[PDB]
Design a protein around this ligand. Sequence first.
Ligand SMILES: Nc1ncnc2c1ncn2[C@@H]1O[C@H](COP(=O)(O)OP(=O)(O)NP(=O)(O)O)[C@@H](O)[C@H]1O
Ligand SMILES: Nc1ncnc2c1ncn2[C@@H]1O[C@H](COP(=O)(O)OP(=O)(O)NP(=O)(O)O)[C@@H](O)[C@H]1O
Ligand SMILES: N[C@H](Cc1csc2ccccc12)C(=O)O
Ligand SMILES: N[C@H](Cc1csc2ccccc12)C(=O)O
Ligand SMILES: [Mg+2]
Ligand SMILES: [Mg+2]
Ligand SMILES: [Mg+2]
Ligand SMILES: [Mg+2]
Lengths: 260, 260
Amino acid sequence: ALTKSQTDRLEVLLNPKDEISLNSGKPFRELESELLSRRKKDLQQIYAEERENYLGKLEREITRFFVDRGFLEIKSPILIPLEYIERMGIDNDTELSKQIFRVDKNFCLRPMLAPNLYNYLRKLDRALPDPIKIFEIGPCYRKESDGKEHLEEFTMLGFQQMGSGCTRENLESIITDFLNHLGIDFKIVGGDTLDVMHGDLELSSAGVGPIPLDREWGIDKPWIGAGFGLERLLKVKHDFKNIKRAARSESYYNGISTNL
Amino acid sequence: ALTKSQTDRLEVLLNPKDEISLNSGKPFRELESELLSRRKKDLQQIYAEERENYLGKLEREITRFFVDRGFLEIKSPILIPLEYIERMGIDNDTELSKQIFRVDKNFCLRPMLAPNLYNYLRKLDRALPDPIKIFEIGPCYRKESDGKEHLEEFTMLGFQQMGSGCTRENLESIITDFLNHLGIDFKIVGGDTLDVMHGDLELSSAGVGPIPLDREWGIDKPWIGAGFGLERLLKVKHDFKNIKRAARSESYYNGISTNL
Ligand SMILES: Nc1ncnc2c1ncn2[C@@H]1O[C@H](COP(=O)(O)OP(=O)(O)NP(=O)(O)O)[C@@H](O)[C@H]1O
Ligand SMILES: Nc1ncnc2c1ncn2[C@@H]1O[C@H](COP(=O)(O)OP(=O)(O)NP(=O)(O)O)[C@@H](O)[C@H]1O
Ligand SMILES: N[C@H](Cc1csc2ccccc12)C(=O)O
Ligand SMILES: N[C@H](Cc1csc2ccccc12)C(=O)O
Ligand SMILES: [Mg+2]
Ligand SMILES: [Mg+2]
Ligand SMILES: [Mg+2]
Ligand SMILES: [Mg+2]
């Protein structure tokens, strides 16, 4: 009989592709030594042969996809004015107001990319030809209850197109090409809203404008856009049972435990 | 006579390669219209032809340099335990303690990469062959007085090697190959410390261990490493007069004003 604590320890060391039954007769000590050897070899193979981090590599692959498709790569501030949250319509009744990491008196860690993308669309509308296509990838922050699908520090991809061609059909085509390119199974389920699901897991929320909120941001053109969590994409792709395996972490490297 | 406010406005629109004398007889209104046209064309050319952000592209170029050189790419948390700052020896007498962005009661936005790199070196020492070579690129945060060389939100490259080959000569060779690869002029000036200078601007501080601090982090092997600011590298490379031109920003895109 393995104790529940010895099983938690072995499950840290287990990778989805492992073919080992934790319930078989071998003693903890031996099963731990086997898995430690495997995970050490896994890290050695990464270090010898490719050396790229899953989250960095995914960001670079997504970047090439969107640049190639005519979207401008944005890198905007992560620490943003608290006033942006209110101007997004996030009042006390909405659940997100309680999820904000505040910094100082007038700043917060951004929980979303939409504010900065709105500001860029408005400013670039002055210099760039129709349609304006932009995207950003980077850290976002939300206070969350413990969950196998939520991190407090995560990474989001946001893209938005404004002007002509901003139809639901074009939006679904971008999403569909994107996820088939990455090899991620999905279903699209549906101010017009749209969620991109993998089973019960939300990969993305997507939107079609105009919506009344646009006016506060100086936007008055149709638009389409979506936001995706990179760690959720990694979790699906690598079949991780807990999203912590995909996070920025000192505890996991490319889903391999670092506590060996 | 241009007013000092009209000159500030024109200097936002001026790019280093511009050949225009702000002091010549043409009226503000005309000089503004010329520069607006130029900056709009500049943005249009980026959008038509490459579409990559300076900071993202630099991060990807640095990543390839270090991966190719045998360094493992790390992506570790940006929001870190406040206890890491104290354990770095950052007490009240040191100036950095006053520079920390605190979050909640027990967390902060990291002002440096050294804590997470120490933790990774210690853990990986258990699985990887000697020498252990790692690097990370990502956001760091410090409270700063207004300066043409300091941002409160910046991006740092940190690399560290532990075990054999950890000589000052090897460290200077990495730095030298790196900056000659990027095309950035520098001088190295020098527990052994080393600063990499561009004129009066510090591009990097570098170090050779062991040092007594290592013991608190579970490290007991020689090491070499360095930290570089990406926005400072961009500032030098593109001859920006103020580092805000290179930052994560809503006010500049690849050093071009977005307020057109
Ligand atoms: N805490 C989180 N951890 C990881 N990914 C997240 C988190 N919050 C949001 N995301 C991702 O970001 C995308 C866009 O954000 P958003 O639509 O606001 O999320 P959401 O509606 O709060 N999803 P959920 O909390 O799972 O019901 C989501 O579809 C996820 O893929
Ligand atoms: N506020 C900042 N804005 C931009 N880059 C920075 C900032 N602080 C540090 N860096 C960069 O990060 C590198 C390593 O950090 P560190 O050696 O701690 O900086 P530092 O000693 O405080 N430099 P300085 O404040 O200019 O005297 C520096 O050499 C810079 O290239
Ligand atoms: N639910 C949204 C996801 C998103 C990011 S950019 C963007 C542009 C259009 C639609 C959605 C988004 C959010 O919370 O940001
Ligand atoms: N002054 C240092 C720069 C740095 C980052 S990683 C690293 C590893 C070795 C030496 C320096 C560094 C700091 O403040 O972090
Ligand atoms: Mg949520
Ligand atoms: Mg949603
Ligand atoms: Mg300083
Ligand atoms: Mg220094």
